[PDB]
Amino acid sequence: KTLTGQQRLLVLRLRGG
Amino acid sequence: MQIFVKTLTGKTITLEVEPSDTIENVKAKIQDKEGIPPDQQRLIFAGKQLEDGRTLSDYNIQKESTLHLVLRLRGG
Amino acid sequence: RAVVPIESNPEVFTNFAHKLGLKNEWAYFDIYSLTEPELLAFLPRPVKAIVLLFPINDVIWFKQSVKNACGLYAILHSLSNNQSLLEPGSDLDNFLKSQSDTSSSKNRFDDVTTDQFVLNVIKENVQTFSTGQSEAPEATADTNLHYITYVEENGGIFELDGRNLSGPLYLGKSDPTATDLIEQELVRVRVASYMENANEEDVLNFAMLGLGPN
Amino acid sequence: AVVPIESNPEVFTNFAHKLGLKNEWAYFDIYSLTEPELLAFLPRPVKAIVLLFPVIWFKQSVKNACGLYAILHSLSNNQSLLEPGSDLDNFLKSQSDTSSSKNRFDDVTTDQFVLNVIKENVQTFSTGQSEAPEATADTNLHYITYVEENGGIFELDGRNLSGPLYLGKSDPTATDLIEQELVRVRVASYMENANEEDVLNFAMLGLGPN
C-alpha cells in the first residue's frame, strides 16, 4: 500500500530540490 | 448569525442569516453568491434533509453550524 | 434520438434502476462528502457503484448511442457489473443472459442489439427522464455536464464512460482491505482530481450518487 | 547548490529546531490521506503539510534548497510555534519592524539570511536513510507546502514566481489541515497525474506536536 493508492515499512525516503 | 455551507468539492460558503430565515431564504442567499438556482439545491444538517418552508430555528441550527449542499443537476 | 438529461436525484436513479431490475433491497443515495468520517455514517454500506456527474473538462461496458442518455448508461454500468443485485427475470437480467448464451459481445455492448434494448427502455420510461426537483430542459439541448461510473469487478477498479471510445478505463487493482468502493483510494483520487479542475474554474457543478442498500 | 533533502521527519525536525521551531513540535510521516485508523496515530493539530512529488512566501534562490524553503514556509506561517529570540523569529520580526517585504521575501536581507542558514547547517543536508547525490545533479522531485492562514488555504512553492497560490477558504469544522478538503483535493490531483504515469515518487510530512 503506497501513499498514491529508499523504503520504510510503504513510505518513501526521497530527495527533492 | 454566521453559518457555513460546505460543497462536495471542498468549497466553504459563509453566510449571515437569522434564526427566522427559512431554508428557501438560505437557498436564495446561496444563489446570490454562487448563482445556483434553488430548485437545484438540497441542504443537509446533521444528516437530515432540510425542507424549504421550515426555518433555521425549527432545526435548531446555531451560530457557526455547518450545512451541506447537494446539487440536483442534469447531465447528458 | 435525444432524451431529456436526467437529474442527479437519488429517487429518479432509484426509479429507473428498479424498473430495469435492481432488487428492491438496494437504491441510489446522495454522496455529499467523499473523505468525511461523520457524513459517511449517514451513508449505506456496502457502496457497490458510484456515479459522478461533472463538467466534461474484465468488465461490462456499453457504448453510448443516444444524446443526453449518459445518466441511463451510468445506471446500466452500475447494474450490469453488479448482476447479483438484479431480479431474476427482469428486463436487464434477461438482456444480459441472452448475450452470454449467444456470446455476442462478452463485455463491449456496442451492437445494434444493445441500441434496441436501450431505445425501448427509453420509450417505456420517457416521463422519468423529466422528473426530479429541477425543471426539465429540452432533449435537443446540450448540458456541458456528463455522468460516469466506478465499480470493482474481478479485483480491479474501473471508470466506465459510454462516450470514452477506447472503452472502459482500468484504474488499477482493488485493495482487499476495502469495506467497499468508498474505501478505494484509486477512486477517491481519480474523483478528487476532477474536483481540482472545478475548484480552479470556480465551478460547483458536481454531484455523486452511491448504489447501496435500502 | 545544496544536496537535496531527504523526505525524512528526523532531518526536517532537526533543521526546524535549529531555526527556532519549539521542541514541543516536530515533523512526522503522513502515509495515508483519507484513512481513519492511520489518522489516530498522527499527532494533531497538523499545522503545515509538506509534499514531495515530481501569508509569508519566499522566492527560492539556491539550487536544490526547496526542502529548506518548505521548512521556512511551514515555520514562517506558524510563528506562534517559534522560540522567541531564535534565528527565524528574529529574521521575521526584523522585516516587520523595518517593513521591507511584509510577506514576499526576495530581497538582499532574505538571500543572506538564508545563505547563512545554509552555510551554518551544510552537514544536515546530507543526513538520513539514503545516499547523498551531488548538489550539482538534478532530482526531478520538488517540495511544496500547505498552510492555513487567516482562514485562507495556500500552496507555497519557492519556484512559483507568481508567489503563494490561494486555494480558497478554510472549513472551520476542521481541527486541522488534514481535515481540509481543499488540501486533500489539490494533493489528490497531483497523485492522479502520478497514477497514470506509474510514478510512485511521493512523500508527505506533517508539522504537529512531539
The DSSP bridge pattern shows strands D25-29 and D203-209 to be antiparallel
Which residue in the list D66, D156, D183, D205 is annotated as catalytic?
A: D66
What is the number of CB-based contacts under 8 A between chain B and chain C?
93
Q: Give D186 to chain C, closest Cα distance, Å.
A: 6
- Of B65, B36, B43, nearest to C32 (Cα)? B43
Interface test with D, best of A8, A10, A15 (most D CBs within 10 A): A15
Please name the method used to determine this structure.
X-ray
Question: What is the H or E stretch that residue D95 is in?
Answer: helix D87-97
Is the CB of residue C39 less than 8 Å away from at least one CB of chain D? no
List chain A residues with CB under 8 Å of C184.
5
Any chains having at least 3 CB pairs less than 8 A from chain D are: A, B, C
Cβ contact, residue pair B4, D172, below 8 Å: yes
Q: Measured between alpha carbons, how far is C54 from C146 in angstroms, rounded to an integer? A: 6
Strand, coil or helix: what is C152? Answer: strand
Q: Which residues contact D123 (CB under 8 A, 6 or more apart)?
A: none
Q: What is the 3-state secondary structure (H, E, C) of C100-128?
A: HHHCCCCCEECCHHHHHHHHHHHHCCCCH
Check: CB of residue C61 under 8 Å from CB of residue C107. yes
Would residue C77 show up in a list of annotated catalytic residues for this protein?
no
B7: phi then psi, degrees, rounded to nearest 5:
-85, 175
DSSP summary character for residue C175:
-
Q: Give A5 to chain C, closest Cα distance, Å.
A: 5
- Of B2, B20, B9, B23, nearest to B66 (Cα)? B2
Q: Give D186 to chain B, closest Cα distance, Å.
A: 10
List chain C residues with CB under 8 Å of B69.
32
Which residue in the list C70, C75, C121, C148 is annotated as catalytic?
A: C70
Q: Give A7 to chain D, closest Cα distance, Å.
A: 9
B1-75 belongs to CATH 3.10.20.90: yes
Cβ contact, residue pair C189, A1, below 8 Å: no
For residue C152, list its beta bridge partners: C157
Give the domain range for residue C185: 1-214
Which CATH number belongs to the domain containing residue C46 in this structure?
3.40.532.10
Q: How many domains is chain C partitioned into structurally?
A: 1
DSSP summary character for residue C154:
S
Q: How many other CB atoms are there within 10 angstroms of residue C137's CB atom?
A: 15
Grid cell, residue D186, equals 489539490
Q: Measured between alpha carbons, how far is D35 from D32 in angstroms, rounded to an integer? A: 6
Strand, coil or helix: what is C192? Answer: helix
Count how many residues are written for chain A.
17
Grid cell, residue C158, equals 474501473
| Residue-wise burial string across B9-22, b where 16 or more C-beta atoms lie within 10 A, e elsewhere | bbbbbebebeeebb
Check: CB of residue C162 under 8 Å from CB of residue C193. no
Which residue in the list D44, D63, D93, D142 is annotated as catalytic?
A: D142
